[PDB]
Amino acid sequence: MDIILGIRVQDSVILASSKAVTRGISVLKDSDDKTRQLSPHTLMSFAGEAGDTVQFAEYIQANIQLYSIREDYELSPQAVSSFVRQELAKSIRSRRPYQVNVLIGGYDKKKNKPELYQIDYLGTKVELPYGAHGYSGFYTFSLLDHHYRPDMTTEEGLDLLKLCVQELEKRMPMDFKGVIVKIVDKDGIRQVDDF
Amino acid sequence: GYDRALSIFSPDGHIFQVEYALEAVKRGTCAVGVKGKNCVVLGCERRSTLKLQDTRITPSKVSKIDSHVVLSFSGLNADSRILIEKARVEAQSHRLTLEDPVTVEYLTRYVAGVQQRYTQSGGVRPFGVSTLIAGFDPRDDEPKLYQTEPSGIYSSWSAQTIGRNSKTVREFLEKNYDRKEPPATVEECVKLTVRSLLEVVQTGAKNIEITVVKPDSDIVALSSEEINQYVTQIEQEKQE
Amino acid sequence: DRGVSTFSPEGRLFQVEYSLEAIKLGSTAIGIATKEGVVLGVEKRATSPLLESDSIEKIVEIDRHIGCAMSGLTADARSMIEHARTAAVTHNLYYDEDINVESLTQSVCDLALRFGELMSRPFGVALLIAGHDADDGYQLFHAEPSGTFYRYNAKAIGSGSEGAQAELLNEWHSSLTLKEAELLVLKILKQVMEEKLDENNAQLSCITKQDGFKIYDNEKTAELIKELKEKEAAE
Amino acid sequence: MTDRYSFSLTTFSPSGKLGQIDYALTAVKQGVTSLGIKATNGVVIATEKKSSSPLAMSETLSKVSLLTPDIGAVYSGMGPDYRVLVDKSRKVAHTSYKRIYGEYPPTKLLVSEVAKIMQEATQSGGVRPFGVSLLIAGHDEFNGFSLYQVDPSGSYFPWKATAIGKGSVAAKTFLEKRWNDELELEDAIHIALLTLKESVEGEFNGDTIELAIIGDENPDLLGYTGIPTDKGPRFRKLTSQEINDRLEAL
Amino acid sequence: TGYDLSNSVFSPDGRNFQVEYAVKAVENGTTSIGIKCNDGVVFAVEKLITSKLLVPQKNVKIQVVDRHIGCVYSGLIPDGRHLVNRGREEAASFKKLYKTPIPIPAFADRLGQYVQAHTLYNSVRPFGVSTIFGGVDKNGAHLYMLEPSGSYWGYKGAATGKGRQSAKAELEKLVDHHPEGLSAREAVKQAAKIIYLAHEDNKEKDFELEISWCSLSETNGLHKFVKGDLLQEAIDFAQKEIN
Amino acid sequence: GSRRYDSRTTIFSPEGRLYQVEYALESISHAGTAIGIMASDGIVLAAERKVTSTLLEQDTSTEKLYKLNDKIAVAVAGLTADAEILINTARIHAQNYLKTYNEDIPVEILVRRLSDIKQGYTQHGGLRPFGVSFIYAGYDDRYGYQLYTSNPSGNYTGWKAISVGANTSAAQTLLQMDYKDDMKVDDAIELALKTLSKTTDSSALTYDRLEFATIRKGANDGEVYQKIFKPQEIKDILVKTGIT
Amino acid sequence: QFNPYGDNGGTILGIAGEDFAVLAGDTRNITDYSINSRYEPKVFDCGDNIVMSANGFAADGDALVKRFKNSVKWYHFDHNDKKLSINSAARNIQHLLYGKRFFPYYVHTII
Amino acid sequence: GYDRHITIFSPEGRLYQVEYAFKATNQTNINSLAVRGKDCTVVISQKKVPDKLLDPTTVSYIFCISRTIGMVVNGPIPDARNAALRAKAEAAEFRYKYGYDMPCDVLAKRMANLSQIYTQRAYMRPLGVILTFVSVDEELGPSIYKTDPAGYYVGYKATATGPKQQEITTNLENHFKKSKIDHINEESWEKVVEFAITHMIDALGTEFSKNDLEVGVATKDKFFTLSAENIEERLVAIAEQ
Amino acid sequence: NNYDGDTVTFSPTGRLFQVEYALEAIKQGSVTVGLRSNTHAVLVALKRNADELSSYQKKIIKCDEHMGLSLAGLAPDARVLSNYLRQQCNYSSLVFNRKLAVERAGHLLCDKAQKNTQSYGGRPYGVGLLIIGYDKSGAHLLEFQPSGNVTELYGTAIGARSQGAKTYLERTLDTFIKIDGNPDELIKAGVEAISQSLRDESLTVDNLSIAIVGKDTPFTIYDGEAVAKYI
Ligand SMILES: [Cl-]
Ligand SMILES: [Mg+2]
């Protein structure tokens, strides 16, 4: 599984997600994109059990896209996060629960504010200035508790994020093969190609 | 469960419930589809016995099934919502399993199949709806226009109309549409569509809706003034 | 009213007999079987000139070795074709072989009487099923909504059927070549059709052991139409 | 076998009437008169006990029924239909309210549940509507005293006072002259007995009349002591003797 | 009117015309009888020989339920078989739960309730048979006759079919002439005579006789068919009486 | 069998109309008139009670106007019992949406689902349709103030001003005459009462034969308030406009 | 706890020539250290010139052979007495076995 | 007029199928009667065996529902037995569920509720029977409760049912006008049976042999039917007074 | 008239018209004959075509190695009923290692047809069947009618003009019953029997269908050039 991080700054939400897919003693892929665009201004990164992750992500994607076409309207990040939470809260008491942890980064166009939601497989939702899933938080949170300001720019956020990846690449046991970084703001979703 | 076979054959070999569903379509407001060289235009009549309407919130006559395909109809409005919903769900399901949006032919084939199913299932009546389905296949620039009807038959059309007085507007399109040279631009296609509706409508005020679909999910609905300019221009050329 | 599965005093099922009237209103479809292959041809019959005729699909593939033509309420045929394709592919999965044409036809005909108070009414469409297998060679079957199927050397269904069938009675012999059969379908279709026959309002197809089931191009059929007109003028 | 009647037996006629509901109301019109009057400190519901035979024991047939300790019901129309509705009404007060909130439903909501049951018999497959109109009287802490009428359609209306059945037209007119917003419970009982005498033909005594009140809490009818908050049922059925006492000063 | 078009509908008389119409189908059928005797019951039936091509002895009509009950019926033969199949299911479940073989009165009500159930709904048709049945249980011999309505009673003698009145008259004479009781072997002979006498009402086609019996002493309380010497002896007794 | 007694409630006439829907609309045309008027700063709901008796309890009564949630209300015309079945479904549906998305349900979404339920009863199941027409009045942050109507067919449409029930033809003509877009709530209140007063089948319009409600942003700052009028408040508003 | 499987021992062997094929098997049947039978055949002629053996747990072995023999019978009924080729038999037996993938026939099958 | 074929309302608010089921009640042409003593409840019914080929011991319209409850039926035997089997099953289940014997009035209500359902539900016809339940209830004492195809039920001081029910009813009314009490003031059930037969003879105007009658008696903790000789013993006692 | 809308309705004289109408479909069917000796049982069937371009509708169906039938009426109904017989024969073999008695086969068909004549919604089967077989009690011939009535016979015929063959077999009874240990002669008698039901048409090579089962003969069907011997 692995490193999914999220930082909400003044005007945007930044998601960083590891590129490795490891099975057994082999790294099968080093360019995996652990994210799905749910709507033009809403991105979801995911991590957990093999198969479950993509299956859940795409299922949520299909539902939000269906809603968009039906109402000719984009759901708010808060609304999408609540829908996702409920689906996971249902799942946890099913015969076979989805073992998937997600971060949802969105830009609310009605409020003109970035929003980051952390939701685990149990359906535990929180809104946070910065978030992480798995062992990643054990490293990066103290770093973010120190350096994070609520009025940071997107560039300042990316530098703050570089600091986190560097710490993880130093102290983490596994080679997670770097991260794919994506920014969510007023203009939508774009990928940083050189990280 | 209610089981009654409502759609059945008569001695002469007709299924009257299917044929009466076509009469409901004939009562509905006129709808027209015209495809150009690089676009499809869907035009729709709106009856004017209803003043004091709120057009912001009133259900529009042309519905997006996906970002690249649209559906208009003639007949029972309530019935059409059920077909539109099912079509929208199948659109997302196709993207999920095939990893590619639906072709216009496929989406039409699905909608037509649903309609057919309601003609030989117990306890249900046929849909009192005929549809015009238009759009562009993924990564394709060839315009697509299809028509479905209550029986379940579907087919492709260079241009077609359905609803009340559709036989009058079909007559117009049959002599005004050249297969060898379809409307080369967006303007030409919208005009031929507006012209065809003006044979039947009344005033070109808040009675005509026009929606233009271009390749790669490029769909936009025209406003009153934009349509009114076509109405104004056509009438001045007519006085000759 | 009355039950959907009711018998008439003459010992026939009302709904089945009435569906046969619906099929008589349908567009003409003809099939001819030879030792070189089976030919399937249909009248497209567009209701209006604005309708793009190549979207009219009344000849259909079931498998590589089996093809099908239809007449009547053609919307009713979709689920019949869907079943036929699944039956053909499923048999290949279970037995690693091609399914016999007769076995396919029997499977489709099993759906037919599954109506009552199962679906609410019989199918309003007749099918011509043509194919090849190693045991019985080239075969043509006529599948009805009664659940009955006959093998035919040649057969016409639809509005122009009784006139076309009488013509097929005179023309068919056991030594017809594939080319001879192609021309014969075109000739007889041109006779019973309302509008003048051309490549846009009529469609040809065949099934051969070597190349399987093929729907002909409008270009290929047009040349066979031209070859036919020239031969009739030549005596 | 099996219920093949999965379709509606009540449908709209071209004029817009729902035939079976209209015909059910006609059955209610033929029914014996029953009434209800709301006072400031209570409610009274009353009806005639039409005996089928003098060999029958009319005490064994109760037209006025307790639904909850604070709610009672009376009817006009078909007795059997009423009996099963009372069974269903008593149960639904528990299943859809008491088993959830640990207290009895307020009058308006229990009435709402009975109305639902009667509405469904108007739309569901293979059933006719109920051939009764109900009068339900009750009390609850936040609404005080109330009186409701429920019809075969499932519609219900609140009343200060009303009558249903045989001589309802005359009885309603009588109640309009006598009803004011300052009536005390005893005054309402007096008027109830006066109104009922007009529609009753034969014997008029405590054995031919059935009458119950919704009034003060009755600790003596609770059956136990020790819980201060439990103070007893407000529903009380007047005895044959209690009715005759009031028929002398009539 | 129209009250007779649907089963379970009461007419203004308080009648179910559909059941009365099923009775007409029973009256059309061949004659069958039942005779109660000292320690058992005897059943007999008329089998019309439609053609020379019918294999003799090989279209058996009397049916056994469990090992101690015999059933015969007149009317729609398939309807009778359906009733016996149910009877066999009822008897099996009784023996399953309670161990002892089903008593005859108990068995009678099982068929009765089942036939009565087919008068409660318009989605089923009443049975087109009257069934004569019985056997031996712990309380001795019992003979019953069940009708399309579900109505059944215990009988000293029973008859149904086209020659029921002829057979009934002949049965009443036996009851009057034998107040103490009739023996099993005698009842077999009498059954043959009565079927031959009841055949006068169906005398175009000649017939084949079929008899069965349950007796505490003669068959050990089990149902058996009468065959061979005992059958021919009973046929001869009947032939002598018609002449 | 039972085929004999089946009315076939979900079939087409030879003209392509649904018999039962048409007949349900005929039923609704005899119900008390209800009017909805949408202003720029709020919505008015006005409805006439069906011929009242003097002994009817007027204050503790509800017949025409029902609350679906804090932001949406409906005016009813038709069978009240049928309406309550649908109202409870609508109330639940609103709460399902709020539970799922943590946002109050958009008005159209609620209207569509309720209209879809009506549609179903006209296509399958062999049951009679609901004999009810609704006027929906509500607010959400997407479209602001909205008026809708639905009828037994399951067809719904949006309005600036609309009437259902009795005398809709006359009522609509009167609304079409005096309505304008820049109208305020207090003006709409007057129009609603004036229209009922002229279309009523009664002798004179009084407080005891009316139900009245407003949906304003006339609370304190950027929030919506539902005011179901009390009897005395209807008496006062009837005097204030000089009808009595 | 009840164990639905057992082991009946024995061994089987198939060899193919140019115009022939043999399928051999010993006739011993066992449980644990006891002999159940010295002659209990487990190689069977299934019709259409197909011989089959399913060796391991004999109850499963017999059940499978029984089902395949029945499959040959219905193949004739459904496809105009057509001969079931060995390759078609093989594919059919795969589906018989995989149909019980989560409660397997405890056998090694050779045709 | 299909409103006369199934249990839906007619324009005048009537249920014709229920009304016609009431007429089926008299199809057997048998009259029944029930009275109460101090300690007992006696029910009597006519027994008509027309066919000589019938086994007279199997012809009965009185049923032992439970140890304490008896039931006499007025109506065709198939419907009668249908009602009896259900009543037996209901009484047995009540005892198992609630730990005490089902009271006569409660069984009457339950069977009346079932009958009500057939008047409201279309697929089920009413049973063409009237059911009279009798017992000596441990709380209420001697009890008579009667059910009909409308689903109506009520308790009785005494009752009668059949074609000539009105004659028997008024005969009983006139006795209770005279006696001024709710029951037969008698110690033994034997004399209450004698009263029942005596007043049936007076009302119907016919004499009875031992095979023309059928008698059921309910006492504390058991209901039982009388044999032909028990009735004969009873007939002799009446004649010798 | 008013009582033929469904199978659940009796007429005032106690008739079931839907069952009688189903019986009528058999009468329109092509003639088929059945006969037996003590060693063999034989079916002979006249096949019917749509026209000269069509095949001849197959009338005979195999049910087991020892049993099979011929049909007259609705062919799909014969397919349903024959399939049921195939299953019942098969159940008897798998569960009891027992060949299904031809008599039980008759009882099972009777009960299956009956259920379709007493319930709402269903319809009677519209086909008649002649079942032949050889079991533990020798050769057998049965006649099935969709009323439910099954009958065991030495010989019979059903279909259009079946009365001719039925009369012939009634005359020939004493002769053909003793054709033991001679298949070709028993067939010859059946072919002569079906010839009494022919009008304007005669027995050709793709017209005649013969089936035989017996002591040392599995149920086998003969068509085409294999029946040329008998013309
Ligand atoms: Cl109950
Ligand atoms: Mg009923």
Side-chain angles (χ1 to χ4, degrees), chain D residues 71-234:
Chain D
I71 297 163
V74 74
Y75 81 105
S76 287
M78 300 172 68
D81 282 15
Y82 168 72
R83 194 180 56 249
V84 301
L85 271 172
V86 173
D87 293 333
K88 291 164 190 284
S89 295
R90 285 164 173 171
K91 195 183 186 177
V92 79
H94 280 78
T95 58
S96 77
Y97 205 94
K98 199 189 183 226
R99 290 177 193 184
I100 297 166
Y101 301 108
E103 61 198 60
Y104 291 99
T107 307
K108 66 190 168 173
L109 286 180
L110 178 57
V111 165
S112 177
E113 297 288 352
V114 187
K116 188 184 191 253
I117 291 166
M118 289 167 79
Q119 189 282 335
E120 290 169 2
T122 271
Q123 194 166 18
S124 307
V127 288
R128 63 161 173 82
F130 288 94
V132 286
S133 281
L134 303 173
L135 294 178
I136 298 161
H139 177 271
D140 60 82
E141 197 187 336
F142 293 80
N143 295 277
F145 297 99
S146 58
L147 172 71
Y148 287 87
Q149 180 184 335
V150 191
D151 279 351
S153 66
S155 298
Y156 58 96
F157 337 93
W159 289 97
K160 289 156 175 169
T162 190
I164 46 167
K166 214 169 179 73
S168 59
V169 190
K172 285 212 295 288
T173 315
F174 193 97
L175 293 169
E176 288 176 36
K177 281 178 174 169
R178 306 304 210 95
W179 194 92
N180 58 69
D181 63 356
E182 274 161 292
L183 285 175
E184 208 255 302
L185 181 56
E186 275 294 344
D187 301 318
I189 294 165
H190 179 75
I191 295 160
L193 293 164
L194 278 162
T195 314
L196 208 54
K197 188 183 276 189
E198 301 293 297
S199 56
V200 176
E201 200 148 47
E203 304 288 66
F204 195 74
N205 53 50
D207 299 308
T208 54
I209 298 307
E210 206 171 331
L211 197 150
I213 56 152
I214 308 300
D216 290 342
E217 293 158 320
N218 295 256
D220 58 307
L221 292 174
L222 186 54
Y224 65 94
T225 61
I227 301 168
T229 53
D230 296 358
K231 272 164 280 177
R234 291 176 174 271

Side-chain angles (χ1 to χ4, degrees), chain E residues 21-112:
Chain E
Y21 289 3
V23 170
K24 294 288 190 186
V26 180
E27 292 172 0
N28 193 246
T30 70
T31 313
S32 60
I33 53 164
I35 308 170
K36 189 189 182 177
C37 69
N38 282 332
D39 62 343
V41 285
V42 176
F43 310 99
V45 65
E46 166 185 29
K47 296 162 64 172
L48 297 178
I49 305 173
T50 316
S51 171
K52 272 271 188 184
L53 299 159
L54 289 171
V55 182
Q57 265 63 36
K58 276 301 252 273
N59 285 298
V60 185
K61 291 182 82 175
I62 300 169
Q63 283 186 280
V64 64
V65 172
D66 203 295
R67 265 124 94 156
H68 68 298
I69 304 165
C71 299
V72 72
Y73 40 79
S74 300
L76 306 185
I77 299 306
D79 277 21
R81 278 193 53 79
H82 178 98
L83 191 54
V84 171
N85 287 143
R86 177 71 184 200
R88 289 163 172 174
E89 286 171 16
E90 295 280 10
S93 88
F94 190 96
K95 168 124 66 81
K96 189 182 188 293
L97 180 56
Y98 305 125
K99 192 69 166 70
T100 178
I102 187 157
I104 317 303
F107 176 71
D109 201 54
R110 294 296 180 92
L111 295 184

Side-chain angles (χ1 to χ4, degrees), chain C residues 27 42 73 76 109 121 139 154 186 216 222 224 229:
Chain C
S27 61
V42 299
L73 295 169
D76 288 15
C109 286
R121 55 170 184 82
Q139 296 157 259
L186 258 22
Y216 297 172
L224 291 162
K229 215 221 290 95

Side-chain angles (χ1 to χ4, degrees), chain F residues 216-230:
Chain F
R216 294 170 158 269
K217 202 168 280 172
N220 298 46
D221 272 41
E223 71 202 346
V224 163
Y225 178 53
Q226 271 176 322
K227 198 185 203 293
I228 310 295
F229 280 59
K230 299 175 190 292

Side-chain angles (χ1 to χ4, degrees), chain H residues 7 118 121-125:
Chain H
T7 55
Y118 317 141
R121 221 99 87 190
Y123 86 110
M124 289 249 52
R125 71 165 172 86

Side-chain angles (χ1 to χ4, degrees), chain A residues 79-146:
Chain A
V80 169
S81 74
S82 293
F83 171 76
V84 170
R85 196 205 81 83
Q86 194 183 55
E87 289 298 302
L88 289 166
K90 280 186 204 160
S91 170
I92 200 58
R93 290 171 196 281
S94 304
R95 192 184 52 77
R96 199 178 61 75
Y98 283 114
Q99 290 180 61
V100 184
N101 298 307
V102 304
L103 298 171
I104 292 167
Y107 192 90
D108 194 329
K109 296 281 278 178
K110 307 212 83 166
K111 288 178 167 188
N112 290 300
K113 269 178 159 64
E115 280 178 357
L116 173 70
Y117 298 94
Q118 185 179 131
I119 313 170
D120 73 3
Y121 72 105
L122 303 170
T124 317
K125 193 184 94 175
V126 231
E127 203 282 315
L128 292 168
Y130 39 92
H133 273 300
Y135 294 117
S136 312
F138 279 89
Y139 280 114
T140 60
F141 284 164
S142 76
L143 209 139
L144 270 11
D145 282 353
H146 187 61

